[model samples]
Target chain A: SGFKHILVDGDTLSYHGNSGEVGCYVASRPLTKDSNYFEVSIVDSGVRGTIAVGLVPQYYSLDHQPGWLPDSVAYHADDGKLYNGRAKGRQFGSKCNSGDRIGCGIEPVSFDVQTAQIFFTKNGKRVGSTIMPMSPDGLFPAVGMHSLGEEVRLHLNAEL
Target chain B: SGFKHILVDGDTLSYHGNSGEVGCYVASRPLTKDSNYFEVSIVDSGVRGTIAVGLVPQYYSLDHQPGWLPDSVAYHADDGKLYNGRAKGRQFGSKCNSGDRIGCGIEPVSFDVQTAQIFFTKNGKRVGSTIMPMSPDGLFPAVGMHSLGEEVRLHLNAEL
Candidate 1:
């Protein structure tokens, strides 16, 4: 058989401050199917005032082990935070100081029979995308790879 | 009255590096008779060569020292050296260097008088024209007005 699809859901989006001063969280729903193809999209609202939209995606092994997948996309703000689109694990601050736009798409990833795709948009306009595999085994070391995941992560920067 | 004519002559342009490490110079010649109306062009012969060209009119005042004009324009190169269009000046050394292509014309100090003009060209192609006062002091300050008999100046950058 090809690759089975697994839906991982939750706010999956979060933000971290550059100076370690503040952060916030936004939840997202995971994929609910088992197929060789998958797609993720995100839209941000509070991005107008203080927060900046950010996202990330994470993958796990069949046995539920922490499988390592290299993040191929990398973006940074003036505040100096890196983001990967998986797990929303770390916080990356927003670079947009003032703008009223939302939504962005992440890229898609494919490997040994598994594939992941992410997408995001701002005000109905596509902003970013990324695709990656589902394993970080020896065949794929995490050297130039972004520590982030293969999901569209939003970076919302604000006080509190 | 109407515009007058000036001859094409060789002039020196200089600049001091902001970091005070390099000094640069450019050998500029009038391309037009109107010193106040002219253009500057340059052909860089570095390994990865480059060509830069621009046009500008002289409008600044140097009334105090009528005879004193910008010896040259100066700016910091990516290499932190002072370049005045002549010497290579100081270079940031790392792939970050700065230089300029300049054009200049001289005019009389009298507001009523106009000078001849020069036509600028690069590799056999006319690029710009300039006009200036016929005599060094032709455009001299009026008896009662404030006019320092000085040469007009113009400067800009180039990349190779």
Candidate 2:
């Protein structure tokens, strides 16, 4: 097997697989501590099918189709909506495709330490807010690829 | 079962679990463009046995004992060696340990476009360079933990 997802270097270079299989790649570490921000861009996106980027859990299915699973929320490109696996929240602006830059931010910090939310911006415009609820865990920078050849690029700006 | 590692938020606030089991965490997305740069800090390394921040395949052992397997390269904190699984490189700079800040960088981009290599930095000093031979696959920000609680943090800063 080649690689469904591989972190190329210590610098966080990543790549999606070619089996058209649904997959996700998460940060090598956990999140939430004031200001969590990272950017995702489409390199090729294969067929560009159903792809999304947001915060998901370690237990989130890496092989379950396209839409998010339980304990996950993301901006789905196929439907042009921000989905938390339950409902489509609202328009997240960018139906992220090739060259589109999506910026995601989380304020405050840990889900256990107070109230928190998820905010997204595409190409520099605020795409509105989505209800981001976290339990004791499930805080990892995650992205989902639904179709074959779907590829995403992560430029993690994860700092205060 | 608690998350061994979590992306605190988009800001990349990450932590290592308090269990002395070898662990691996990867970025939710991949990287491209070039000048891929991200820094990791050891908030605390439980036993501080062996800690490494590198790129590993999705098939790599996230639950192995400790240390990286073949097909990966990282600055191993155990003996301060820039390990390439297939090859044992030289020391980059200061041996990384608990509380120390580690910086990682990659040259050029793409497996087919151009050539790429890996380098390390301790605190603020350039730890020299190492041979970062990546295959046609295996691209993700990955880490290796040898003991309990070998936490790390990341944020993209490609301007260097």
Candidate 3:
């Protein structure tokens, strides 16, 4: 899915879709020492608008390989296991169904790369262990689209 | 404000508070990654109940210092600097007022040991730059109450 940054209903960030599009909306503000917050919600997984949320670096979505995001840790509301980004990562969590709130933090609460861990919260609950082995830089609240009409909303603490 | 994990109208978390008693509710999950996410909102401030949000390694409280909370990051809703236990930071952003939202993260996104950074967000907006330095293990969402009947609601993402 292509991601877009458009806020609706006051604080809700919206992302609609078509094709040739796999947008990933990342808040302009990047969390350095402080952890920027964001919530991912599937407004209406538009027929096929699959949503993904996580920390995207400066080089995120630049070039797609085969099995992972170049500079991002993407969490598909439809699957698990960190495909690209995460800290001390693991197998992942439950399916972020419609309205299931997923909380994410790209914190380098820091101790070099080892201290870099990114995780997600489901409606305020932890999905699993820290899911990502390292964190380098350029972390932002990023959302992605892959389907037909997957609409996603982001509640970002680091707003645009 | 009385923070209810109970979503507001159609949201994920809503906390509406009235009078007496300052409250700080942490999620059921403690951070193993030392990175925690939480939002602090002033619900009426109850005669300047004010607020303080930060990272509590084990468990945070509404009480004092001297010992327990040595390795922590505390944000005073009324101050412009960090207090208690911080790694090696500087004067932070402006003071937080009522009706505003404070987002905090004990992040060490990059750099080495002496480069830990922690920051806060106002309504998802960056208040400033890397405000604090230094970080240890066991960081979790911690809140502090300075006045009587100060009501604060927390949307903790590190729930077990």
Candidate 4:
């Protein structure tokens, strides 16, 4: 009925599910402020390092990857690309490793701009930025892992 | 000819000047975004660790440390205090050492609030926040070192 494969211990998450399937976790708090940021460090990339980090809606399926569904955008660690509400990904940044840190943030634009700038950082340096429409339901920090032992530590609004 | 004592190598500043005197360096660009952030990592605390990190006006004297003048606020590494426009400092955070990262950020408030929230972070966690009145001449990231061998690496709007 609930999450059984992913063990949640404070800020760290460990995935023990099957290799073919993915288990996604979302932060409890929705990013409410105009400027928001969150970071995650890869603890163990497991077998394939198919990790995803980004923002997503609360109702997003827990069994799916972050960017594979609508209203979500994520950076795939395995491919070093960014995905926006689709399975296809585009060039973004470097592939992440066990000790690499990944951060996602959003900055508000003027009222007339009509979109917010969402950016990602790898190991404290900015990789790239893209425009994302403002979400009415509010987006939350989400992470997904597809492996038997993928693990990560999450820090909300905190530096890595 | 200029800055003979302090060697400026790209983003790093090393102070080889006298111990009693202070040398402050300001970033070339002023912080223009409504939500601005900057960070510095202590490369070498030198002899006293009397390092200062904060924002100041462009006209701030290079001979004085940040927060010792008008329109300036800084966090002193040796005393672990926050100084605001004066020599006196209030208890703020922990004393910084080599390899520690210090960060300062400002988030805009509603127009009715009339004040911005300025906060600091040590390592990866937030220390505290205070209210700062808007500046008319713009503020820039500044760091002051008061020892013979103090060195720090500055990163504007980039995480550490």
Candidate 5:
């Protein structure tokens, strides 16, 4: 299951499932020193629906550690504050029944999936992107769907 | 059952029940102004947590509304974006969590019990005075009181 058509909104992209079911995930890849554009697929039960894409600067990196257990992970937002052990399940702003913007980010750091633990440095100094875990129940509820009309595409740019 | 001593935390307070069983409760009155102080005493089945305490300015207010609400009631810490209805619990910073010296503020609004809603305004704001029904839960937790022995009386000053 891969992506088909990626729909784009201001700073966000959403993927739509057939019959209007949809899921949106932030794609933090293809990061360039300059703002980079990335792609994601709309998938259901392992099947690709279409694609929705957006842009974000490659602001951080994710490093998989060999050994450690992480109950959760922390990320520093643009606000310069550290949010500890925040995983991905619902949108960042979902808890208080806020809008769909789920606040996510990582201070330069790494994670050891096998041990499920997190480390506080990269390349010597603390440097790494933060990764949020999805909820155990399922992906966050869809805020809405994008009409691919067989396929939708978008363009975005992010700064490094 | 009544309270002997009650301590105020942010939105919660700790009470020494007449039976000496300690417990925490959501404050009946939330601190809307920074450095504001209040007192509580015991009265009936529960504790009254007496009144007649001095007041100071509040350090900060709770960003209770969820992140997704409309523009009328929500508060964003970084940029002051207005979130209408979605707001909930509070998130603390490293300074707050670590017990380091930090600045705080009260929510820029008042809570109305009869309407079961929060209003955004300090129109009739009073200084050195205590507000009632600060919380729906009617409990007040002490600041930084993890144990009974650590409980202390509250005092007030105009500024930190």
Candidate 6:
């Protein structure tokens, strides 16, 4: 609650946030339209390389990384897994590192807002997509990081 | 900077941030496509009522509010003025208060990404539009709140 220890300088976030406490930062703006996407560029993976990139509602927990909580889904950089509202994550992609760009987007299934498709990308290429229950207000691009000096940059207009 | 005085919880931002030193918070995502928009709902105007909502580059200065620096444009809620790359601002709209939802967006002219139209809204209605130079990486929804307890909420999917 006290500054979350994550230093938010511009669009880049560096997690010292008390180091390894699992702090999450969401885009100040939420994704409103279908096909809205954003990417996270790993500046430095930090001590553990514990980075999670995904989509989350506005009111997600800073105590846990993204994908650990219900109403959220994320692709963890360390394990190359996608965590869908659970502590355990399934294999989603290759483990990410500094300089890798991981992207995520959402697409509704033909007027069905209740269930929509969420997808992730790597370095401008689509890695895969998954379907999940949509949050009522919508999801904002979110990233979770642990360890000192773990840094990532957000790109709302990523080319992929 | 040791943990910006602003506390980010969900989509809302509450500023104590050393009380009165200008501080800005930007969306983790940027506006990539044409007509991308977002809104800010004023939860409380704080002591000075020095709230500013606008568009700014990813690498803006936290020392100054949005619109005071180059490559940024913002509408100050206290003065109802729009600051376009200058310390002084132009009269833009009515001074906003605790329940007002202020919106900002970008609309680039055909094929000309360099100069684009940025507009602001109150509640669900459009207040006006202005043209300014666009930042290279695109602009993210940004807000500047000074003074104790100034708070706001972000709405990326507003009706209007």
| Model 2 per-residue lDDT tens digits across residues B46-148 | 5664667776544444443212567666777766777766445555555667778766666544445334466677775777665545542345566556565
Q: Give the DockQ of candidate 5.
A: 0.01
TM-score of B-chain for each predicted structure, in order: 0.23, 0.71, 0.61, 0.88, 0.24, 0.89
| Candidate 5 residue-wise lDDT, B45-153, digit = tens | 1222111111111221222112232222222222222222234312111111111121112222332232112211111221111122234222222222212432323
Measured with C-alpha atoms, the lDDT of residue A111 in candidate 2 is 55
Q: Ten-residue segment with the worst summed lDDT in candidate 6 chain B?
A: B107-116
Q: Report the candidate with higher lDDT, 3 versus 5.
A: 3
- The DockQ of each candidate is 0.01, 0.01, 0.02, 0.01, 0.01, 0.03
Candidate 6 C-alpha lDDT tens digits along A1-160: 0113355554677885563476666554666564478899999998889989998775565557888988899999898998988999998789999999899887634224676578898888888888776642377778888887799987888755
Model 2 lDDT tens row, A14-127: 445556555666665555554367777766555755667777666556555322566676677665576656543443344667677666666554355433466666776555
TM-score for candidate 6, please give it: 0.49
Candidate 4: C-alpha RMSD to true structure equals: 17.0
- Tell me the deviation in Å of residue A64 in model 3: 6.0
The most accurate candidate by DockQ is 6
Residue by residue across B76-139, what tens digits does model 4's lDDT show?
9888899988999999999998999888876644223455566788886889887778552267
lDDT of 1 by residue, B50-72 (tens): 11122112221211111123322
State which candidate, 2 or 5, has the greater DockQ: 2
Q: What are the per-residue Cα lDDT tens digits for candidate 6 across B50-142?
A: 888888887788767888998788889898877768888764567998998889876533124655566677776655555454542377778
- lDDT, candidate 2, residue A17? 59
Q: What tens-digit string does per-residue lDDT give for candidate 4 at A61-101?
A: 88888878877888899987777777877655679989998
Q: What's the true lDDT of residue B154 in model 3?
A: 63
Question: Which prediction has more favorable lDDT, 1 or 4?
Answer: 4
Error of 4 at B149 (Å): 33
- Per-candidate total of colliding backbone pairs: 116, 38, 34, 0, 81, 5
